[PDB]
Write an enzyme that holds these catalytic residues in place. Structure first.
Site, PDB file in Angstrom:
ATOM      1  N   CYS A 109     -10.971  42.267   5.786  1.00 50.26           N
ATOM      2  CA  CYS A 109     -10.906  41.196   6.791  1.00 50.26           C
ATOM      3  C   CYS A 109     -11.175  39.799   6.236  1.00 50.26           C
ATOM      4  O   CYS A 109     -12.245  39.528   5.715  1.00 50.26           O
ATOM      5  CB  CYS A 109     -11.890  41.488   7.937  1.00 50.26           C
ATOM      6  N   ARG A 112     -13.867  37.134   8.431  1.00 53.25           N
ATOM      7  CA  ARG A 112     -15.278  37.436   8.611  1.00 53.25           C
ATOM      8  C   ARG A 112     -16.229  36.267   8.771  1.00 53.25           C
ATOM      9  O   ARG A 112     -17.377  36.471   9.085  1.00 53.25           O
ATOM     10  CB  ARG A 112     -15.771  38.379   7.517  1.00 53.25           C
ATOM     11  N   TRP A 281      -8.351  37.236  16.376  1.00 52.26           N
ATOM     12  CA  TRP A 281      -7.142  36.469  16.594  1.00 52.26           C
ATOM     13  C   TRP A 281      -6.295  36.583  15.337  1.00 52.26           C
ATOM     14  O   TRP A 281      -6.772  36.987  14.295  1.00 52.26           O
ATOM     15  CB  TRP A 281      -7.444  35.004  16.984  1.00 52.26           C
ATOM     16  N   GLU A 286       0.321  37.389   9.274  1.00 48.63           N
ATOM     17  CA  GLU A 286       0.415  38.786   9.719  1.00 48.63           C
ATOM     18  C   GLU A 286       1.702  38.957  10.523  1.00 48.63           C
ATOM     19  O   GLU A 286       2.412  39.963  10.391  1.00 48.63           O
ATOM     20  CB  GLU A 286      -0.784  39.166  10.596  1.00 48.63           C
TER      21      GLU A 286
HETATM   22  C1  HEM Z   1     -11.694  36.343  14.654  1.00 46.68           C
HETATM   23  C2  HEM Z   1     -10.610  36.368  13.836  1.00 46.68           C
HETATM   24  C3  HEM Z   1     -10.153  37.389  12.943  1.00 46.68           C
HETATM   25  C4  HEM Z   1      -9.197  37.161  12.029  1.00 46.68           C
HETATM   26  C5  HEM Z   1      -8.614  35.761  11.735  1.00 46.68           C
HETATM   27  C6  HEM Z   1      -9.065  38.326  11.213  1.00 46.68           C
HETATM   28  C7  HEM Z   1      -8.096  38.490  10.221  1.00 46.68           C
HETATM   29  C8  HEM Z   1      -7.847  39.695   9.557  1.00 46.68           C
HETATM   30  C9  HEM Z   1      -6.723  39.942   8.692  1.00 46.68           C
HETATM   31  C10 HEM Z   1      -5.623  38.950   8.253  1.00 46.68           C
HETATM   32  C11 HEM Z   1      -6.791  41.206   8.311  1.00 46.68           C
HETATM   33  C12 HEM Z   1      -5.731  41.967   7.530  1.00 46.68           C
HETATM   34  C13 HEM Z   1      -4.792  42.497   8.609  1.00 46.68           C
HETATM   35  C14 HEM Z   1      -3.676  43.343   8.042  1.00 46.68           C
HETATM   36  O1  HEM Z   1      -3.098  42.934   7.008  1.00 46.68           O
HETATM   37  O2  HEM Z   1      -3.376  44.408   8.633  1.00 46.68           O
HETATM   38  C15 HEM Z   1      -7.939  41.767   8.949  1.00 46.68           C
HETATM   39  C16 HEM Z   1      -8.315  43.093   8.794  1.00 46.68           C
HETATM   40  C17 HEM Z   1      -9.451  43.644   9.357  1.00 46.68           C
HETATM   41  N1  HEM Z   1     -10.307  42.979  10.251  1.00 46.68           N
HETATM   42 FE1  HEM Z   1     -10.265  41.059  10.778  1.00 46.68          FE
HETATM   43  N2  HEM Z   1      -9.967  39.289  11.584  1.00 46.68           N
HETATM   44  C18 HEM Z   1     -10.607  38.740  12.693  1.00 46.68           C
HETATM   45  C19 HEM Z   1     -11.443  39.490  13.562  1.00 46.68           C
HETATM   46  C20 HEM Z   1     -11.843  40.803  13.361  1.00 46.68           C
HETATM   47  C21 HEM Z   1     -12.813  41.468  14.194  1.00 46.68           C
HETATM   48  C22 HEM Z   1     -13.462  40.859  15.419  1.00 46.68           C
HETATM   49  C23 HEM Z   1     -13.050  42.691  13.665  1.00 46.68           C
HETATM   50  C24 HEM Z   1     -13.917  43.736  14.118  1.00 46.68           C
HETATM   51  C25 HEM Z   1     -15.008  43.579  14.925  1.00 46.68           C
HETATM   52  C26 HEM Z   1     -12.199  42.728  12.476  1.00 46.68           C
HETATM   53  C27 HEM Z   1     -12.131  43.811  11.640  1.00 46.68           C
HETATM   54  C28 HEM Z   1     -11.212  43.953  10.594  1.00 46.68           C
HETATM   55  C29 HEM Z   1     -10.987  45.173   9.871  1.00 46.68           C
HETATM   56  C30 HEM Z   1     -11.747  46.492  10.000  1.00 46.68           C
HETATM   57  C31 HEM Z   1      -9.886  44.983   9.093  1.00 46.68           C
HETATM   58  C32 HEM Z   1      -9.080  46.034   8.353  1.00 46.68           C
HETATM   59  C33 HEM Z   1      -8.040  46.601   9.342  1.00 46.68           C
HETATM   60  C34 HEM Z   1      -7.149  47.642   8.705  1.00 46.68           C
HETATM   61  O3  HEM Z   1      -7.565  48.197   7.660  1.00 46.68           O
HETATM   62  O4  HEM Z   1      -6.046  47.912   9.252  1.00 46.68           O
HETATM   63  N3  HEM Z   1     -11.470  41.586  12.304  1.00 46.68           N
HETATM   64  N4  HEM Z   1      -8.600  40.830   9.707  1.00 46.68           N
HETATM   65  N1  LIG Z   2      -6.077  39.659  12.952  1.00 41.30           N
HETATM   66  C1  LIG Z   2      -6.365  40.973  12.983  1.00 41.30           C
HETATM   67  N2  LIG Z   2      -5.534  41.782  12.367  1.00 41.30           N
HETATM   68  C2  LIG Z   2      -5.564  43.233  12.222  1.00 41.30           C
HETATM   69  C3  LIG Z   2      -4.522  43.845  13.165  1.00 41.30           C
HETATM   70  C4  LIG Z   2      -3.124  43.222  12.977  1.00 41.30           C
HETATM   71  C5  LIG Z   2      -2.420  43.644  11.663  1.00 41.30           C
HETATM   72  N3  LIG Z   2      -1.497  42.564  11.304  1.00 41.30           N
HETATM   73  C6  LIG Z   2      -1.651  44.952  11.793  1.00 41.30           C
HETATM   74  O1  LIG Z   2      -0.491  44.958  12.255  1.00 41.30           O
HETATM   75  N4  LIG Z   2      -2.300  46.044  11.367  1.00 41.30           N
HETATM   76  C7  LIG Z   2      -1.715  47.426  11.176  1.00 41.30           C
HETATM   77  C8  LIG Z   2      -0.593  47.501  10.104  1.00 41.30           C
HETATM   78  N5  LIG Z   2      -1.400  47.635   8.857  1.00 41.30           N
HETATM   79  C9  LIG Z   2      -2.768  48.178   9.113  1.00 41.30           C
HETATM   80  C10 LIG Z   2      -2.838  49.463   8.278  1.00 41.30           C
HETATM   81  N6  LIG Z   2      -3.994  49.941   7.845  1.00 41.30           N
HETATM   82  O2  LIG Z   2      -1.827  50.084   7.968  1.00 41.30           O
HETATM   83  C11 LIG Z   2      -2.759  48.419  10.647  1.00 41.30           C
HETATM   84  N7  LIG Z   2      -7.436  41.445  13.608  1.00 41.30           N
HETATM   85  N8  LIG Z   2      -8.243  40.846  14.495  1.00 41.30           N
HETATM   86  O3  LIG Z   2      -9.077  41.571  15.109  1.00 41.30           O
HETATM   87  O4  LIG Z   2      -8.212  39.575  14.741  1.00 41.30           O
END
Ligand code: HEM
Ligand SMILES: N=C(NCCC[C@H](N)C(=O)N[C@H]1CN[C@H](C(N)=O)C1)N[N+](=O)[O-]
Ligand code: HEM
Ligand SMILES: N=C(NCCC[C@H](N)C(=O)N[C@H]1CN[C@H](C(N)=O)C1)N[N+](=O)[O-]
Ligand SMILES: C[C@H](O)[C@H](O)[C@H]1CNc2nc(N)[nH]c(=O)c2N1
Ligand SMILES: C[C@H](O)[C@H](O)[C@H]1CNc2nc(N)[nH]c(=O)c2N1
Ligand SMILES: [Zn+2]
EC number: 1.14.13.39
Lengths: 405, 405
Positions: A109, A112, A281, A286
């Site tokens: 993420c 964070r 958000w 993405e």
């Molecule tokens: C507030 C704005 C947030 C933004 C800008 C953000 C952005 C991102 C981005 C760009 C990724 C990679 C997404 C992808 O390539 O699939 C990501 C992954 C992740 N985020 Fe955040 N994040 C935010 C909030 C959160 C929140 C609130 C949580 C949990 C409470 C979170 C948990 C995670 C986790 C666990 C991953 C890995 C997801 C996966 O493996 O598919 N994120 N985040």
């Molecule tokens: N901005 C995100 N992004 C995470 C979710 C959107 C992300 N672009 C998505 O499509 N995630 C899928 C495709 N790849 C991840 C995977 N592990 O394969 C899940 N999260 N958030 O809480 O604000």
């Protein structure tokens, strides 16, 4: 012992001492690094109790009441409950702390820096799919906030020994359908064909568009999943237009405002929450880069290229790069136009660099998966590209889990 | 399936297992506790012999005479030579096989599909700095081939027991001077400030330009390095112009045609060639994105954005992404115009995917450093981004070695 971490743009160096706190093994070994792999290849009381004690210890340190009487007492309770029942329950305050920490600890993420501002909805008193639906709707409504997105997580009942899991079958609360049409081609989102087919098989009347919001398949323990259509008015969407390319809007592209992963397992103090959708958000790339340009997704690169009078004859004209950029520009402009929270990859990576610094001072490091943190376009133009990162598993943690079907 | 790293391509859904990593006899920097895959950086005749035997087995296997009389005779001969001298020497054909395998084994090289066409220049008879210069000039002349670049490597005498190493002090055979200014800024390439000052300290009369080709500081065993100015007619450069932005040519930017890493150590069967400069041809993002846009390098992004009249006050205008694309395009266009071999990041990565397939068949895998294989711009737009990769060290190998000063 402690990894030396260097930033090559600034020449600065740090040492990650936080990694020593990792209790869970990643996929690498000295023989070979598998850091680029996307996924990994009734618990014993002792194991559970140590994780629980550790988490409770993290919690009281968090409120600067470590060692206190309240701390001793709580540990006793957990111990008492595990010894007698083989499991225990978290108090809402601990659940709140635990969820924030899992986010903070998520190596993939880049958002964070926001970790401390997370609205935690306790949905552990949920006993039916219908109730799950109500909580999910509340989460979406709260989180969307008319485009002023607010980070949130709704936590459903923890897994229990020998009983089925509460599960949201969908990979995200809001996702577009992917319908396989004769040709083998897919109308809508190819990443969601299976789930779309599962919804259909479970009685959903499918649409036929490119952006049909899927219904939720919610599963209460040991029951077949149930279908729930999200009230269209709770699902904010953003039509995509370009700031100067008038024809962009004609592509009829749009994307939902709320990214809300719903298939990850939230692990806290040894407890497992199989349904705990979270949302923050979007970072524009993405949508603009992966969702829209991945070849196995909407794959619109060529279309936009052609609409741009670009020479898609040869790769050397960089038509793909050029189209990709305008698409990302389109996404940003549109979300900003619709007044829906969105962050670009530069602002995001800069804030993540600050987060790295905050975390270095706060915990002596920050687990980060470089391949995921570095944006999918303009990688080296962002600061994180030049930043070495250490990846490891800290708990509380969000983790992958098998699809429920 | 099987018990080896399972490698997945997420774009194609295809799977392979890397069995080649089983052949890795040298540990990388990762452990189950944490992944350090993003870090830029990390003789007992007994240890040498095992490496030498391993290499001779590799050699004999390659000529399909494994277990043959010649094989056992060479193995015995190597043990004998090592026995009486502590080291051994490679036969010509063995050096050729070794240099090609080292390239083949380079995890960070996306140009490995060309590994079999390497021209190996044996300069193991070289005995002076002046002669190294002649050999190097010959390499440059042969490799540049007036723009139709030919991969080549010139191997100077291996590291000797007590004797000093043959060393090329420059990081590349062709690099631009970096002049530290009074105001602290740098004129030319900031990456080359130290070597530039070293050349001055060794009697080089410094120029004052942004693109002064550095002289070579060559070091024969146990002798201070000697300074050699490359005859300008041998150093092919490409003035940079943009196919459409007519003012780009006015920026007076240029780059050299031959990328020739000259400070790496070529290790073969335990033997160490401290001076074995190699060269192929450029992948355009190396120049356009890294050399020209890294904030710590020519840092021309803002200048080009201003010329393009972009809004550099806000990240969301994607001005950085926009200028970066144009710069890369200028690089491709100029090299093509000047008829100098170059490959864009799309062509190079597709060719690398082919290479992965070839190697999957030929060796059961291919060591690759994902962070390095995926280009600095348009990452997910290329196929390698969606390709999981296993990184490990095989030998023969090219390794970083400490700067000789
Ligand atoms: C507030 C704005 C947030 C933004 C800008 C953000 C952005 C991102 C981005 C760009 C990724 C990679 C997404 C992808 O390539 O699939 C990501 C992954 C992740 N985020 Fe955040 N994040 C935010 C909030 C959160 C929140 C609130 C949580 C949990 C409470 C979170 C948990 C995670 C986790 C666990 C991953 C890995 C997801 C996966 O493996 O598919 N994120 N985040
Ligand atoms: N901005 C995100 N992004 C995470 C979710 C959107 C992300 N672009 C998505 O499509 N995630 C899928 C495709 N790849 C991840 C995977 N592990 O394969 C899940 N999260 N958030 O809480 O604000
Ligand atoms: C034939 C054309 C070639 C192309 C297009 C190519 C391209 C590349 C690229 C893009 C990189 C990463 C460079 C960087 O980011 O600094 C690289 C690294 C490397 N290449 Fe190749 N390469 C080619 C030829 C060669 C040859 C002939 C050899 C050796 C015999 C070789 C050995 C390596 C090694 C060892 C590295 C890593 C260097 C380092 O760690 O700084 N390459 N190559
Ligand atoms: N295409 C290359 N590329 C490698 C040399 C050029 C590369 N773009 C470069 O400037 N490499 C320097 C800066 N970074 C590397 C490092 N390890 O720090 C060395 N080589 N070849 O033989 O064809
Ligand atoms: C194979 C490779 O690990 C895979 O394509 C990764 C790379 N980096 C990523 N980075 C982010 N943010 N999201 C992803 O889905 C991926 N996919
Ligand atoms: C910290 C990170 O490892 C570093 O910036 C790497 C990333 N990927 C790279 N990839 C290539 N080809 N060349 C480089 O110099 C780098 N630098
Ligand atoms: Zn690793």
């Amino acid at each position: 012992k402690f990894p030396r971490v260097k930033n090559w743009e600034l020449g600065s160096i740090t040492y990650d001492t936080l990694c020593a706190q990792s209790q869970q093994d990643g996929p690498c070994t000295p023989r070979r690094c598998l850091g680029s792999l996307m996924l990994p290849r009734p618990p014993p009381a002792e194991q559970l109790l140590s994780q629980a004690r550790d988490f409770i210890n993290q919690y009281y340190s968090s409120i600067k009441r470590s060692g206190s009487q309240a701390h001793e007492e709580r540990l006793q309770e957990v111990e008492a409950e595990v010894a007698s029942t083989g499991t225990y329950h978290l108090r809402e305050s601990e659940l709140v702390f635990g969820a924030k920490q899992a986010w903070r600890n998520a190596p993939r993420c880049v958002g964070r820096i926001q970790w401390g501002k997370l609205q935690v909805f306790d949905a552990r008193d949920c006993s039916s799919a219908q109730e799950m639906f109500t909580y999910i709707c509340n989460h979406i409504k709260y989180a969307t906030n008319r485009g002023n997105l607010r980070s949130a997580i709704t936590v459903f009942p923890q897994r229990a020994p020998g009983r089925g899991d509460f599960r949201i079958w969908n990979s995200q609360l809001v996702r577009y359908a992917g319908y396989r049409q004769q040709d083998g081609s897919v109308r809508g989102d190819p990443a969601n064909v299976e789930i779309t087919e599962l919804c259909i098989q479970h009685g959903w009347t499918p649409g036929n568009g490119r952006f049909d919001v899927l219904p939720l398949l919610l599963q209460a323990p040991d029951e077949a999943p149930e279908l729930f259509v999200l009230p269209p008015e709770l699902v904010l969407e953003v039509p995509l237009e370009h700031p100067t390319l008038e024809w962009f809007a004609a592509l009829g592209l749009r994307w939902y405002a709320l990214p809300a992963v719903s298939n990850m397992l939230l692990e806290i103090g040894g407890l497992e929450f199989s349904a705990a959708p979270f949302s923050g958000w979007y970072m524009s790339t993405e949508i603009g880069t992966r969702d829209l340009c991945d070849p196995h997704r909407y794959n619109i690169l060529e279309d936009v290229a052609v609409c741009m009078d670009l020479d898609t004859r040869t790769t050397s004209s960089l038509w793909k790069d050029k189209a990709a950029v305008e698409i990302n520009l389109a996404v940003l402009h549109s979300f900003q136009l619709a007044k829906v929270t969105i962050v670009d990859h530069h602002a995001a990576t800069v804030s993540f660099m600050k987060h790295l610094d905050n975390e270095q001072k706060a915990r002596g490091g920050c687990p980060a998966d470089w391949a995921w943190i570095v944006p999918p376009i303009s990688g080296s133009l962002t600061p994180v590209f030049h930043q070495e990162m250490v990846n490891y598993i800290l708990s509380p943690a969000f983790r992958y889990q098998p699809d429920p079907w």
